[PDB]
């Protein structure tokens, strides 16, 4: 009881930063380099 | 290969598990970069 | 290693050697193995039958044992078609 | 002919090849039936 007053600005700083980062981040990461003519994304031997 | 007599020579890797795209990768007995040789290396893997 | 002469002949459209037997190892089966090197010891003495074979009938074209463990000897030698990876393009070709 | 059998129609997919994977070609042998290479009567069924 005594950590519910962290616990609503852990909520209120989560949901701030969630609403920063839809603004400036919202739909950026959906290029990607496949193989020319492919559907295979190109990679190397330990990359993600 | 279970021993480092075993591990020569070379060996195919499979793209995505497709037994139709392989490439030639030369097989090396490895050792792991933290591992319990002595009382040092066991204090380091220990540490990590 | 040998490396042989390699003219170039008819009934073969490709450079074969008739001094020797040519050895083909699938790509990854290790030469140098014990079980390897014990079967290119004895089969080393099938180049003398090989020879006479072709020599009593020169109209003969490959004559092969394939090993059940994986060597093929070929006579005459002549180099493979695909090499594993001194080009890219890999081979798969296993005897059995 | 020194052409293989054909079985079906072929179907290829471009969008999922990688450029460099050295895909397997054939092995089989060249086995056409005495009645696939002609035309076919049935006299030319009982010869056979």
Redesign the interface.
């Known amino acids: 009881l005594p950590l519910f007053h962290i616990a609503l600005l852990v909520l209120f700083m989560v949901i701030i930063y969630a609403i920063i980062g839809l603004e400036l981040f919202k739909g950026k990461m959906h290029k990607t380099c496949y193989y020319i003519g492919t559907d295979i994304v190109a990679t190397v031997e330990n990359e993600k | 290969k279970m021993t480092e007599e075993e591990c020569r020579g070379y060996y195919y890797v499979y793209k995505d598990g497709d037994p139709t795209q392989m490439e030639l990768r030369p097989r090396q007995w490895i050792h792991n970069d933290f591992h319990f040789d002595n009382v040092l290396s066991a204090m380091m893997s220990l540490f990590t | 290693r040998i490396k042989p002469v390699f003219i170039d002949d008819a009934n073969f459209r490709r450079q074969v050697s008739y001094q020797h037997a040519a050895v083909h190892i699938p ?6 193995s014990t079980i390897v090197l014990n079967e290119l010891n004895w089969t080393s003495a099938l180049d003398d039958v090989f020879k006479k074979n072709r020599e009593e009938d020169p109209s003969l074209l490959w004559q092969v044992f394939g090993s059940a463990t994986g060597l093929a000897r070929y006579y005459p030698a002549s180099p493979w078609v695909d090499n ?2 001194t080009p ?3 081979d ?1 070709y296993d005897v059995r | 002919q020194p052409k293989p059998i054909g079985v079906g129609i072929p179907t290829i997919n471009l969008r999922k090849r990688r450029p460099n994977v050295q895909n397997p070609k054939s092995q089989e042998p060249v086995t056409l039936d005495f009645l696939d290479a002609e035309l076919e009567n049935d006299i030319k069924v009982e010869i056979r």
């Open positions: 790509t990854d089966i290790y030469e140098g594993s990876r890219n393009k890999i798969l």
